Amino acid sequence: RCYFRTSSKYGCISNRNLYVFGAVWKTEDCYQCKCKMNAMVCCSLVSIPKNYDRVNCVGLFHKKSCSIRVVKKTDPDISCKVYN
């Protein structure tokens, strides 16, 4: 999901920081933001796995990839089938 905040004349001001128009960056909470002429747009990078066997599988969150990988509880090296 995405969030918006109107941009300034010189760029996107986000808490004491100024981002130039065209800047793209990832936040500490796994959002990707872009400073556009109209506003700053930040969208969540973490997709929530929708349909899987939550009895024998568990989602593993990886901070660097901003992802949830569904793996077997008995063997986290084996990924589980996830339906869209």
Coordinates of all heavy atoms in Angstrom, one line a residue, unseen atoms left out:
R1 N 0.8 -1.2 0.0 CA 0.0 0.0 0.0 C 0.9 1.3 0.0 O 2.0 1.3 0.6 CB -0.9 0.0 1.2 CG -2.2 0.8 1.0 CD -3.2 0.5 2.1 NE -4.6 0.7 1.6 CZ -5.4 -0.4 1.3 NH1 -4.9 -1.6 1.4 NH2 -6.6 -0.1 0.9
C2 N 0.4 2.3 -0.6 CA 1.2 3.5 -0.8 C 0.6 4.7 0.0 O -0.6 4.7 0.3 CB 1.2 3.9 -2.3 SG 1.8 2.6 -3.4
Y3 N 1.5 5.6 0.4 CA 1.1 6.8 1.1 C 1.8 8.0 0.4 O 2.8 7.9 -0.3 CB 1.6 6.7 2.6 CG 0.9 5.6 3.3 CD1 1.4 4.3 3.4 CD2 -0.2 5.9 4.1 CE1 0.8 3.3 4.1 CE2 -0.9 4.9 4.8 CZ -0.3 3.6 4.8 OH -1.0 2.6 5.5
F4 N 1.1 9.2 0.6 CA 1.5 10.4 -0.1 C 1.7 11.6 0.8 O 1.1 11.6 1.9 CB 0.4 10.7 -1.2 CG 0.2 9.6 -2.2 CD1 -0.7 8.6 -1.9 CD2 0.9 9.6 -3.4 CE1 -0.9 7.6 -2.8 CE2 0.7 8.5 -4.3 CZ -0.2 7.5 -4.0
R5 N 2.5 12.5 0.3 CA 2.6 13.8 1.0 C 3.1 14.8 0.0 O 4.1 14.6 -0.7 CB 3.7 13.7 2.2 CG 4.0 15.0 2.8 CD 4.2 14.9 4.3 NE 5.3 14.0 4.7
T6 N 2.3 15.9 -0.1 CA 2.6 16.9 -1.1 C 4.0 17.4 -1.0 O 4.6 17.5 0.1 CB 1.6 18.1 -0.9 OG1 1.8 18.7 0.4 CG2 0.2 17.6 -1.1
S7 N 4.6 17.7 -2.2 CA 6.0 18.1 -2.3 C 6.2 19.6 -2.2 O 5.3 20.3 -2.4 CB 6.6 17.6 -3.6 OG 5.9 18.1 -4.7
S8 N 7.4 20.0 -1.7 CA 7.7 21.4 -1.7 C 8.2 21.9 -3.0 O 8.3 21.1 -4.0 CB 8.8 21.6 -0.6 OG 9.6 22.7 -0.8
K9 N 8.6 23.2 -3.1 CA 9.1 23.7 -4.4 C 10.5 23.2 -4.7 O 10.8 23.0 -5.9 CB 9.1 25.2 -4.3
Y10 N 11.3 22.9 -3.7 CA 12.6 22.4 -3.9 C 12.8 20.9 -3.8 O 13.9 20.4 -4.1 CB 13.6 23.1 -2.9 CG 13.6 24.6 -2.9 CD1 12.9 25.3 -2.0 CD2 14.3 25.2 -3.9 CE1 12.9 26.7 -2.0 CE2 14.4 26.6 -3.9 CZ 13.7 27.3 -3.0 OH 13.7 28.7 -3.0
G11 N 11.7 20.2 -3.5 CA 11.8 18.8 -3.4 C 10.8 18.3 -2.3 O 9.8 19.0 -2.0
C12 N 11.0 17.1 -1.8 CA 10.2 16.4 -0.8 C 10.9 16.5 0.5 O 11.9 15.9 0.8 CB 9.9 15.0 -1.2 SG 9.2 14.8 -2.9
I13 N 10.2 17.3 1.5 CA 10.8 17.4 2.8 C 10.1 16.4 3.7 O 8.9 16.4 3.9 CB 10.5 18.9 3.3 CG1 11.1 19.9 2.4 CG2 11.1 19.0 4.7 CD1 10.8 21.3 2.8
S14 N 11.0 15.5 4.2 CA 10.5 14.4 5.1 C 11.3 14.4 6.4 O 12.3 13.7 6.5 CB 10.6 13.1 4.3 OG 10.2 12.0 5.1
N15 N 10.8 15.2 7.3 CA 11.3 15.2 8.7 C 12.8 15.6 8.6 O 13.7 14.8 8.8 CB 11.1 13.9 9.4 CG 9.7 13.5 9.4 OD1 9.3 12.5 8.8 ND2 8.9 14.2 10.1
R16 N 13.0 16.9 8.4 CA 14.3 17.6 8.5 C 15.2 17.3 7.3 O 16.2 17.9 7.1 CB 15.0 17.1 9.8
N17 N 14.8 16.3 6.5 CA 15.6 15.9 5.3 C 14.9 16.5 4.0 O 13.7 16.7 4.0 CB 15.7 14.4 5.1 CG 15.8 13.7 6.5 OD1 16.3 14.3 7.5 ND2 15.4 12.5 6.5
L18 N 15.7 16.8 3.0 CA 15.2 17.2 1.7 C 15.6 16.2 0.7 O 16.8 16.0 0.5 CB 15.7 18.6 1.4 CG 15.4 19.0 -0.1 CD1 13.9 19.2 -0.3 CD2 16.1 20.3 -0.5
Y19 N 14.7 15.7 -0.1 CA 14.9 14.8 -1.2 C 14.6 15.5 -2.5 O 13.5 16.0 -2.7 CB 14.1 13.5 -1.1 CG 14.2 12.8 0.3 CD1 13.5 13.2 1.4 CD2 15.1 11.7 0.4 CE1 13.6 12.5 2.6 CE2 15.3 11.1 1.6 CZ 14.5 11.5 2.7 OH 14.7 10.8 3.9
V20 N 15.6 15.5 -3.4 CA 15.4 16.1 -4.7 C 14.4 15.4 -5.5 O 14.1 14.2 -5.3 CB 16.7 16.3 -5.5 CG1 17.7 17.1 -4.7 CG2 17.3 14.9 -5.8
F21 N 13.8 16.0 -6.5 CA 12.8 15.4 -7.4 C 13.5 14.3 -8.2 O 14.6 14.6 -8.8 CB 12.2 16.4 -8.3 CG 11.3 17.4 -7.6 CD1 11.7 18.8 -7.7 CD2 10.2 17.0 -6.9 CE1 10.9 19.7 -7.0 CE2 9.4 18.0 -6.3 CZ 9.7 19.3 -6.3
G22 N 12.9 13.1 -8.3 CA 13.5 12.0 -8.9 C 14.3 11.0 -8.0 O 14.6 9.9 -8.4
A23 N 14.5 11.4 -6.7 CA 15.2 10.6 -5.8 C 14.3 9.4 -5.4 O 13.1 9.5 -5.2 CB 15.5 11.4 -4.5
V24 N 14.9 8.2 -5.3 CA 14.3 7.0 -4.9 C 15.1 6.4 -3.8 O 16.3 6.3 -3.9 CB 14.2 6.0 -6.1 CG1 13.5 4.7 -5.6 CG2 13.4 6.6 -7.2
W25 N 14.4 5.9 -2.7 CA 15.2 5.4 -1.5 C 14.2 4.4 -0.8 O 13.0 4.5 -0.9 CB 15.7 6.5 -0.6 CG 14.6 7.2 0.2 CD1 14.3 7.0 1.5 CD2 13.8 8.3 -0.3 NE1 13.3 7.9 1.8 CE2 13.0 8.7 0.8 CE3 13.7 9.0 -1.5 CZ2 12.0 9.7 0.7 CZ3 12.8 10.0 -1.6 CH2 11.9 10.3 -0.5
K26 N 14.9 3.5 -0.1 CA 14.2 2.6 0.8 C 14.3 3.0 2.3 O 15.3 3.5 2.7 CB 14.8 1.2 0.6 CG 14.0 0.1 1.4 CD 14.6 -1.3 1.1 CE 16.0 -1.4 1.6 NZ 16.7 -2.7 1.3
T27 N 13.2 2.9 3.0 CA 13.1 3.4 4.4 C 13.5 2.3 5.3 O 13.9 1.1 4.9 CB 11.7 3.9 4.7 OG1 10.8 2.8 4.6 CG2 11.3 4.9 3.7
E28 N 13.5 2.6 6.6 CA 13.9 1.6 7.6 C 12.8 0.6 7.9 O 13.0 -0.4 8.5 CB 14.2 2.4 9.0 CG 15.5 3.2 8.9 CD 15.8 4.0 10.2 OE1 14.9 3.9 11.1 OE2 16.8 4.6 10.3
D29 N 11.5 0.9 7.5 CA 10.4 0.1 7.7 C 9.9 -0.5 6.4 O 8.7 -0.8 6.2 CB 9.3 0.8 8.4 CG 8.8 2.0 7.6 OD1 9.6 2.6 6.9 OD2 7.6 2.4 7.8
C30 N 10.8 -0.8 5.4 CA 10.6 -1.5 4.2 C 9.5 -0.9 3.3 O 8.6 -1.5 2.8 CB 10.2 -3.0 4.5 SG 11.6 -4.0 4.8
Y31 N 9.6 0.5 3.2 CA 8.9 1.2 2.1 C 9.9 1.7 1.1 O 11.1 2.0 1.5 CB 8.1 2.4 2.7 CG 6.8 2.0 3.4 CD1 6.8 1.4 4.7 CD2 5.6 2.4 2.9 CE1 5.7 1.1 5.3 CE2 4.4 2.1 3.5 CZ 4.4 1.4 4.7 OH 3.3 1.1 5.4
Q32 N 9.5 1.8 -0.1 CA 10.3 2.5 -1.2 C 9.6 3.8 -1.5 O 8.4 3.8 -1.9 CB 10.4 1.7 -2.4 CG 11.1 2.5 -3.6 CD 11.5 1.6 -4.7 OE1 11.1 1.8 -5.9 NE2 12.4 0.7 -4.5
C33 N 10.3 4.9 -1.3 CA 9.8 6.2 -1.6 C 10.4 6.8 -2.9 O 11.5 6.5 -3.2 CB 10.0 7.2 -0.4 SG 9.3 6.7 1.2
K34 N 9.6 7.6 -3.6 CA 10.1 8.4 -4.7 C 9.6 9.8 -4.6 O 8.4 10.0 -4.3 CB 9.7 7.8 -6.0 CG 10.3 8.6 -7.2 CD 10.1 7.8 -8.5 CE 10.9 8.4 -9.6 NZ 10.8 7.7 -10.9
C35 N 10.5 10.8 -4.8 CA 10.1 12.2 -4.7 C 9.7 12.6 -6.1 O 10.6 12.8 -7.0 CB 11.2 13.1 -4.2 SG 10.8 14.8 -4.1
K36 N 8.4 12.8 -6.4 CA 7.9 13.3 -7.6 C 7.5 14.7 -7.5 O 7.3 15.3 -6.4 CB 6.7 12.4 -8.1 CG 7.0 10.9 -8.2 CD 7.9 10.7 -9.4 CE 7.2 10.9 -10.7 NZ 8.0 10.7 -11.9
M37 N 7.3 15.4 -8.7 CA 7.0 16.8 -8.7 C 5.7 17.1 -7.9 O 5.7 18.2 -7.3 CB 6.9 17.3 -10.1 CG 8.3 17.3 -10.9 SD 8.8 18.9 -11.4 CE 10.1 18.6 -12.5
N38 N 4.7 16.3 -8.0 CA 3.5 16.5 -7.3 C 3.6 16.2 -5.8 O 3.1 17.0 -5.0 CB 2.4 15.7 -8.0 CG 1.8 16.4 -9.2 OD1 1.8 15.8 -10.3 ND2 1.3 17.6 -9.1
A39 N 4.2 15.1 -5.5 CA 4.3 14.7 -4.1 C 5.3 13.6 -3.9 O 5.8 13.1 -4.9 CB 2.9 14.3 -3.6
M40 N 5.6 13.3 -2.6 CA 6.3 12.1 -2.3 C 5.4 10.9 -2.2 O 4.3 11.0 -1.7 CB 7.1 12.3 -1.0 CG 7.8 11.0 -0.5 SD 8.6 11.2 1.1 CE 7.1 11.4 2.2
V41 N 5.8 9.8 -2.8 CA 5.0 8.6 -2.8 C 5.8 7.5 -2.2 O 6.9 7.1 -2.7 CB 4.5 8.2 -4.2 CG1 5.7 8.3 -5.2 CG2 3.9 6.8 -4.2
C42 N 5.3 6.8 -1.1 CA 6.0 5.7 -0.4 C 5.0 4.5 -0.4 O 3.9 4.6 0.0 CB 6.3 6.1 1.0 SG 7.5 7.5 1.2
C43 N 5.5 3.4 -1.0 CA 4.8 2.2 -1.0 C 5.4 1.1 -0.2 O 6.7 1.0 -0.3 CB 4.6 1.7 -2.5 SG 3.8 3.0 -3.6
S44 N 4.6 0.3 0.4 CA 5.2 -0.8 1.2 C 5.8 -1.9 0.3 O 5.2 -2.3 -0.7 CB 4.1 -1.4 2.1 OG 4.6 -2.6 2.8
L45 N 7.0 -2.4 0.7 CA 7.6 -3.4 -0.1 C 7.3 -4.8 0.3 O 7.5 -5.8 -0.4 CB 9.1 -3.3 0.0 CG 9.8 -2.0 -0.7 CD1 11.2 -1.9 -0.4 CD2 9.5 -2.0 -2.2
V46 N 6.7 -5.0 1.5 CA 6.5 -6.3 2.1 C 5.2 -6.8 1.6 O 4.1 -6.3 2.0 CB 6.5 -6.3 3.6 CG1 6.3 -7.6 4.2 CG2 7.9 -5.7 4.1
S47 N 5.2 -7.9 0.8 CA 4.0 -8.6 0.4 C 3.6 -9.6 1.4 O 4.4 -10.4 1.9 CB 4.2 -9.3 -1.0 OG 3.0 -10.0 -1.3
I48 N 2.3 -9.6 1.8 CA 1.8 -10.6 2.8 C 1.4 -11.9 2.1 O 0.5 -11.8 1.2 CB 0.6 -10.0 3.6 CG1 1.0 -8.7 4.3 CG2 0.0 -11.0 4.5 CD1 2.2 -8.9 5.3
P49 N 2.0 -13.0 2.4 CA 1.5 -14.3 1.8 C 0.1 -14.6 2.2 O -0.3 -14.6 3.4 CB 2.5 -15.3 2.4 CG 3.0 -14.7 3.7 CD 3.1 -13.2 3.4
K50 N -0.7 -14.8 1.2 CA -2.2 -14.9 1.4 C -2.7 -16.3 1.7 O -3.3 -16.5 2.7 CB -2.9 -14.4 0.1
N51 N -2.3 -17.3 0.9 CA -2.9 -18.6 1.1 C -1.8 -19.7 1.1 O -1.1 -19.9 0.2 CB -3.8 -19.0 -0.1 CG -5.1 -18.1 -0.1 OD1 -5.8 -18.2 0.9 ND2 -5.4 -17.4 -1.1
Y52 N -1.6 -20.3 2.3 CA -0.7 -21.3 2.5 C -1.0 -22.1 3.8 O -1.9 -21.7 4.5 CB 0.8 -20.8 2.6 CG 1.0 -19.8 3.7 CD1 1.5 -20.3 5.0 CD2 0.8 -18.5 3.6 CE1 1.8 -19.4 6.0 CE2 1.0 -17.6 4.7 CZ 1.5 -18.1 5.9 OH 1.7 -17.2 6.9
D53 N -0.3 -23.2 3.9 CA -0.6 -24.2 5.1 C 0.1 -23.6 6.3 O 1.2 -23.9 6.6 CB -0.1 -25.5 4.7 CG -0.3 -26.5 5.9 OD1 -1.0 -26.2 6.8 OD2 0.3 -27.6 5.8
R54 N -0.6 -22.7 7.0 CA -0.1 -22.1 8.2 C 0.1 -23.1 9.4 O 0.6 -22.7 10.4 CB -0.9 -20.9 8.6 CG -2.3 -21.3 9.1 CD -3.1 -20.1 9.6 NE -4.3 -20.4 10.4 CZ -4.3 -20.8 11.6 NH1 -3.2 -20.8 12.4 NH2 -5.5 -21.1 12.2
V55 N -0.4 -24.3 9.2 CA -0.2 -25.3 10.3 C 1.2 -25.9 10.2 O 1.9 -26.1 11.3 CB -1.3 -26.4 10.2 CG1 -1.1 -27.4 11.3 CG2 -2.7 -25.8 10.2
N56 N 1.7 -26.2 9.0 CA 3.0 -26.8 8.9 C 4.0 -25.8 8.3 O 5.2 -26.2 8.1 CB 2.9 -28.1 8.0 CG 1.9 -29.0 8.5 OD1 2.1 -29.6 9.6 ND2 0.8 -29.2 7.7
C57 N 3.6 -24.6 7.9 CA 4.5 -23.6 7.3 C 4.5 -22.3 8.2 O 3.5 -22.1 8.9 CB 4.2 -23.3 5.9 SG 4.0 -24.8 4.8
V58 N 5.5 -21.6 8.0 CA 5.7 -20.3 8.8 C 6.4 -19.3 7.9 O 7.3 -19.7 7.1 CB 6.4 -20.5 10.1 CG1 7.8 -21.1 9.9 CG2 6.5 -19.2 10.9
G59 N 6.0 -18.0 8.0 CA 6.7 -17.0 7.2 C 7.9 -16.5 7.9 O 7.9 -16.2 9.1
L60 N 9.0 -16.4 7.2 CA 10.3 -15.9 7.7 C 10.5 -14.5 7.1 O 10.6 -14.4 5.8 CB 11.4 -16.8 7.4 CG 11.9 -17.8 8.4 CD1 10.7 -18.7 8.9 CD2 13.0 -18.7 7.9
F61 N 10.6 -13.5 7.9 CA 10.8 -12.1 7.4 C 12.3 -11.9 7.3 O 13.1 -12.2 8.2 CB 10.2 -11.1 8.4 CG 10.6 -9.7 8.1 CD1 10.0 -9.0 7.0 CD2 11.6 -9.0 8.8 CE1 10.3 -7.7 6.7 CE2 11.9 -7.7 8.5 CZ 11.3 -7.1 7.5
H62 N 12.7 -11.4 6.1 CA 14.1 -11.0 5.8 C 14.1 -9.5 5.6 O 13.5 -9.0 4.7 CB 14.6 -11.7 4.6 CG 14.6 -13.2 4.7 ND1 15.5 -13.9 5.5 CD2 13.8 -14.2 4.1 CE1 15.2 -15.2 5.5 NE2 14.2 -15.4 4.6
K63 N 14.9 -8.8 6.5 CA 14.9 -7.4 6.5 C 15.5 -6.8 5.2 O 15.0 -5.8 4.6 CB 15.7 -6.8 7.7 CG 15.6 -5.3 7.9 CD 14.2 -4.8 8.1 CE 14.2 -3.3 8.3 NZ 14.8 -2.6 7.2
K64 N 16.6 -7.3 4.7 CA 17.3 -6.8 3.6 C 16.5 -6.9 2.3 O 16.4 -5.9 1.5 CB 18.7 -7.5 3.4 CG 19.5 -6.8 2.3
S65 N 15.8 -8.0 2.1 CA 14.9 -8.2 0.9 C 13.5 -7.6 1.1 O 12.8 -7.6 0.2 CB 14.9 -9.6 0.5 OG 14.4 -10.4 1.6
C66 N 13.2 -7.3 2.4 CA 11.8 -6.8 2.7 C 10.8 -7.8 2.2 O 9.8 -7.4 1.6 CB 11.6 -5.4 2.1 SG 12.5 -4.1 3.0
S67 N 10.9 -9.0 2.6 CA 10.1 -10.1 2.1 C 9.8 -11.1 3.2 O 10.5 -11.2 4.2 CB 10.8 -10.8 0.9 OG 12.0 -11.4 1.3
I68 N 8.7 -11.8 3.0 CA 8.3 -12.9 3.9 C 8.3 -14.2 3.0 O 7.5 -14.3 2.1 CB 6.9 -12.7 4.5 CG1 6.9 -11.4 5.4 CG2 6.4 -13.9 5.2 CD1 5.6 -11.1 5.9
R69 N 9.2 -15.1 3.4 CA 9.3 -16.3 2.7 C 8.7 -17.4 3.5 O 9.1 -17.6 4.7 CB 10.8 -16.7 2.4 CG 11.0 -18.0 1.7 CD 12.4 -18.1 1.1 NE 13.0 -19.4 1.1 CZ 13.8 -19.9 2.0 NH1 14.2 -19.2 3.0 NH2 14.2 -21.2 1.9
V70 N 7.8 -18.2 3.0 CA 7.0 -19.2 3.7 C 7.8 -20.5 3.5 O 8.0 -21.0 2.4 CB 5.6 -19.3 3.1 CG1 4.9 -20.5 3.8 CG2 4.8 -18.0 3.3
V71 N 8.2 -21.1 4.7 CA 9.0 -22.3 4.7 C 8.4 -23.3 5.7 O 7.5 -23.0 6.5 CB 10.5 -22.0 5.2 CG1 11.1 -21.0 4.2 CG2 10.5 -21.4 6.6
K72 N 8.9 -24.5 5.6 CA 8.4 -25.6 6.5 C 8.9 -25.4 7.9 O 10.0 -25.0 8.1 CB 8.8 -27.0 5.9 CG 8.3 -27.3 4.6 CD 6.9 -28.0 4.7 CE 6.4 -28.4 3.4 NZ 5.0 -29.0 3.5
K73 N 8.0 -25.7 8.9 CA 8.4 -25.5 10.3 C 9.4 -26.6 10.6 O 10.3 -26.3 11.4 CB 7.2 -25.7 11.2 CG 6.1 -24.6 11.0 CD 5.0 -24.8 12.0 CE 4.0 -23.6 12.0 NZ 2.9 -23.8 13.0
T74 N 9.4 -27.8 10.1 CA 10.3 -28.8 10.3 C 11.7 -28.6 9.6 O 12.7 -29.0 10.1 CB 9.8 -30.2 9.9 OG1 9.6 -30.2 8.5 CG2 8.5 -30.4 10.6
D75 N 11.7 -27.8 8.5 CA 12.9 -27.6 7.7 C 12.7 -26.2 7.1 O 12.2 -26.1 6.0 CB 13.1 -28.7 6.7 CG 14.5 -28.6 6.1 OD1 15.2 -27.7 6.3 OD2 14.8 -29.5 5.3
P76 N 13.2 -25.2 7.7 CA 13.2 -23.8 7.1 C 13.9 -23.7 5.8 O 13.8 -22.7 5.1 CB 13.7 -22.9 8.2 CG 13.6 -23.7 9.4 CD 13.8 -25.1 9.1
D77 N 14.7 -24.7 5.4 CA 15.4 -24.6 4.1 C 14.5 -25.0 2.9 O 14.8 -24.7 1.8 CB 16.6 -25.6 4.1 CG 17.7 -25.2 5.0 OD1 17.9 -24.0 5.2 OD2 18.4 -26.1 5.5
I78 N 13.3 -25.6 3.2 CA 12.3 -26.0 2.2 C 11.2 -24.9 2.2 O 10.5 -24.7 3.2 CB 11.8 -27.4 2.5 CG1 12.9 -28.4 2.5 CG2 10.7 -27.8 1.5 CD1 12.5 -29.8 2.8
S79 N 11.0 -24.3 1.0 CA 9.9 -23.4 0.9 C 8.6 -24.1 0.7 O 8.5 -25.2 0.1 CB 10.1 -22.4 -0.3 OG 11.4 -21.7 -0.1
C80 N 7.5 -23.5 1.2 CA 6.1 -24.0 1.0 C 5.5 -23.4 -0.2 O 5.8 -22.3 -0.6 CB 5.3 -23.8 2.3 SG 5.7 -24.8 3.7
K81 N 4.5 -24.1 -0.8 CA 3.7 -23.6 -1.9 C 2.8 -22.5 -1.3 O 2.1 -22.7 -0.3 CB 2.9 -24.7 -2.5 CG 2.0 -24.2 -3.6 CD 2.8 -23.6 -4.8 CE 1.8 -23.2 -5.9 NZ 2.5 -22.6 -7.1
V82 N 2.8 -21.3 -2.0 CA 2.0 -20.2 -1.6 C 1.1 -19.9 -2.8 O 1.7 -19.7 -3.9 CB 2.8 -19.0 -1.1 CG1 1.8 -17.9 -0.7 CG2 3.7 -19.4 0.1
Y83 N -0.2 -19.7 -2.6 CA -1.1 -19.4 -3.7 C -1.4 -17.9 -3.7 O -1.5 -17.3 -2.6 CB -2.4 -20.2 -3.6 CG -2.2 -21.7 -3.6 CD1 -2.1 -22.4 -2.4 CD2 -2.0 -22.4 -4.8 CE1 -1.9 -23.8 -2.4 CE2 -1.8 -23.8 -4.8 CZ -1.8 -24.4 -3.6 OH -1.6 -25.8 -3.6
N84 N -1.5 -17.3 -4.9 CA -1.7 -15.9 -5.0 C -3.1 -15.5 -4.6 O -3.9 -16.3 -4.2 CB -1.4 -15.4 -6.4 CG -1.3 -13.9 -6.6 OD1 -1.0 -13.2 -5.6 ND2 -1.5 -13.4 -7.8

